[PDB]
Amino acid sequence: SEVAHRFKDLGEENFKALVLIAFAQYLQQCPFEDHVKLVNEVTEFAKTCVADESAENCDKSLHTLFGDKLCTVATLRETYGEMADCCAKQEPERNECFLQHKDDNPNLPRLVRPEVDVMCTAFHDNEETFLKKYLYEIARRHPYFYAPELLFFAKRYKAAFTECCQAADKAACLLPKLDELRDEGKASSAKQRLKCASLQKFGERAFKAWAVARLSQRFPKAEFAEVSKLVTDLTKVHTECCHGDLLECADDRADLAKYICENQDSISSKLKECCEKPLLEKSHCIAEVENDEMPADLPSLAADFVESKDVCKNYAEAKDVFLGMFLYEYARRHPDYSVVLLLRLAKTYETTLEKCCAAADPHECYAKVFDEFKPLVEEPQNLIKQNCELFEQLGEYKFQNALLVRYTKKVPQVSTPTLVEVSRNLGKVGSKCCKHPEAKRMPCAEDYLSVVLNQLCVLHEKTPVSDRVTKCCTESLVNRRPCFSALEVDETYVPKEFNAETFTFHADICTLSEKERQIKKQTALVELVKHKPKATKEQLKAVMDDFAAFVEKCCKADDKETCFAEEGKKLVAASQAA
Numbered sequence: 383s384e385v386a387h388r389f390k391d392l393g394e395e396n397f398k399a400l401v402l403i404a405f406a407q408y409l410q411q412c413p414f415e416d417h418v419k420l421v422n423e424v425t426e427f428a429k430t431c432v433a434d435e436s437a438e439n440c441d442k443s444l445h446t447l448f449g450d451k452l453c454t455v456a457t458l459r460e461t462y463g464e465m466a467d468c469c470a471k472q473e474p475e476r477n478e479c480f481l482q483h484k485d486d487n488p489n490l491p492r493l494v495r496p497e498v499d500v501m502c503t504a505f506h507d508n509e510e511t512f513l514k515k516y517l518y519e520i521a522r523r524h525p526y527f528y529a530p531e532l533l534f535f536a537k538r539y540k541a542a543f544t545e546c547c548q549a550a551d552k553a554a555c556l557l558p559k560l561d562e563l564r565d566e567g568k569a570s571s572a573k574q575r576l577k578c579a580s581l582q583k584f585g586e587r588a589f590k591a592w593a594v595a596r597l598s599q600r601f602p603k604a605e606f607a608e609v610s611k612l613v614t615d616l617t618k619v620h621t622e623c624c625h626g627d628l629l630e631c632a633d634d635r636a637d638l639a640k641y642i643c644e645n646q647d648s649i650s651s652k653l654k655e656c657c658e659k660p661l662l663e664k665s666h667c668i669a670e671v672e673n674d675e676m677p678a679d680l681p682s683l684a685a686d687f688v689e690s691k692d693v694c695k696n697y698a699e700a701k702d703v704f705l706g707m708f709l710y711e712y713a714r715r716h717p718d719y720s721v722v723l724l725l726r727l728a729k730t731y732e733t734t735l736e737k738c739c740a741a742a743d744p745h746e747c748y749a750k751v752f753d754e755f756k757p758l759v760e761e762p763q764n765l766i767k768q769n770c771e772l773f774e775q776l777g778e779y780k781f782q783n784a785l786l787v788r789y790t791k792k793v794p795q796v797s798t799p800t801l802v803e804v805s806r807n808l809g810k811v812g813s814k815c816c817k818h819p820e821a822k823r824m825p826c827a828e829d830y831l832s833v834v835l836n837q838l839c840v841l842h843e844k845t846p847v848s849d850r851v852t853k854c855c856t857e858s859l860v861n862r863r864p865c866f867s868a869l870e871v872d873e874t875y876v877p878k879e880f881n882a883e884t885f886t887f888h889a890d891i892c893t894l895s896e897k898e899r900q901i902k903k904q905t906a907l908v909e910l911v912k913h914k915p916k917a918t919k920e921q922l923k924a925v926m927d928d929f930a931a932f933v934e935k936c937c938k939a940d941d942k943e944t945c946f947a948e949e950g951k952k953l954v955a956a957s958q959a960a
Contacts, residue, residue: 386431578624598713694739720828773812782809795848
């Protein structure tokens with residue numbers, strides 16, 4: 383009985399909660415009230431199996447069980463359309479299908495939060511339904527959210543309400559909290575999508591190279607045998623979470639947090655503090671702790687990898703073991719390199735041994751490897767340096783604007799919603815990393831960038847429109863940023879004259895937040911570029927400022943919606959002329 387074993391391992395509580403997330407990530411357009419019953423039904427089942435492993439269907443694979451239930455409601459296409467065909471199939475082709483349909487940008491109502499009073503009440507009336515509703519939405523909206531981590535945010539989102547609802551000034555206690563979780567969930571979300579993308583599009587070897595270089599930077603004191611085992615289990619944890627096996631993905635992520643802690647001394651010292659915390663906080667901590675200190679006396683790399691006359695011999699026997707070794711070593715000494723930079727050097731190295739380990743004399747041709755690493759190391763350091771400066775000058779909002787134009791000119795074929803989302807996020811690299819010593823910037827930076835880019839890649843992949851995007855995204859995971867950074871203004875671009883309406887801002891813009899308002903301004907910026915790419919100097923940065931004026935002005939003209947529309951009509955003529 384697997385659901386019984388799993389049920390035992392996680393406790394009714396988290397079992398039940400994880401079940402809701404699996405379903406809600408498989409069937410996103412499905413109603414909460416429905417997901418609630420199905421989970422209730424699966425939960426009621428689980429229990430009979432705990433009381434008797436020999437019961438009726440207690441021997442089924444979780445997917446079999448989990449899919450028949452999902453299908454008691456998926457088989458209706460006048461509501462769910464395409465999803466019905468997976469229910470036509472069987473495990474494992476059916477689960478395989480389900481995953482194949484997870485929507486990255488569902489056509490879902492934008493979630494708005496009710497007043498603080500409204501919320502705090504609901505919260506007291508029934509905290510369970512209140513939090514169920516949360517897990518539900520966060521999950522239907524972010525189909526690849528790391529199941530285990532979601533249970534953590536859940537915990538944190540609960541205490542916000544508990545604490546803040548007793549507080550004297552509820553709204554002031556709370557608001558900033560819901561703002562922190564919302565903000566930090568998105569980042570989590572994005573980060574995991576990248577782990578699944580790895581696995582799924584590029585495969586396990588890809589992911590392993592990442593986990594090797596990553597753990598190694600974080601645990602430079604840990605042995606390879608050690609770091610290797612962690613890399614194996616970390617890989618199983620994300621495989622399961624990314625291929626829909628969420629209960630066991632949590633069960634295993636627990637075990638790892640336990641092992642790590644149990645073998646604390648041999649991994650890292652910065653761990654002490656996480657290993658005393660409650661299970662969900664211990665895995666989050668461990669998952670996000672800082673890098674340990676580097677060993678006092680570590681050799682010179684060149685010795686075993688470029689000087690040793692038995693490098694090719696060693697590389698040939700077990701390449702992947704020897705190659706992990708290089709990365710592990712190379713990584714541990716440079717926590718100032720982006721992980722993708724690291725993997726780029728491993729890849730240079732690998733191919734460098736393929737070529738050299740067959741040439742007559744091997745020693746003389748690979749003797750130059752680190753010489754090849756060099757240009758690979760400058761470019762990124764020079765790009766973060768360049769984009770940080772621009773940041774201190776323009777400030778965030780404007781910076782994003784510059785990146786919008788930059789990326790819009792680059793990949794014009796792309797949906798506006800997207801260019802506005804990805805570019806605002808690309809933009810956010812400035813406030814995240816430029817506040818670090820020239821040492822910490824590259825790992826913070828480039829990696830941030832990759833997580834942003836993989837966001838595009840998946841939003842674009844849905845509805846593919848530009849080939850250069852598909853190219854840069856499919857060509858190799860490790861070279862995306864360099865790829866996009868390299869692209870230049872698409873001259874093939876066939877613009878769209880000028881829309882009469884899409885530049886008519888409406889009075890209600892005055893009631894939205896200053897965040898959204900920038901998103902409205904920015905969206906039109908994007909549209910601008912998509913009509914006049916050819917010549918767009920500072921002049922653009924100038925036409926944008928009018929609209930900001932136009933809004934600030936017309937939002938306070940005591941008009942009858944008049945000047946908002948009527949000024950717009952004159953100003954759209956002003957922008958078309960210029």
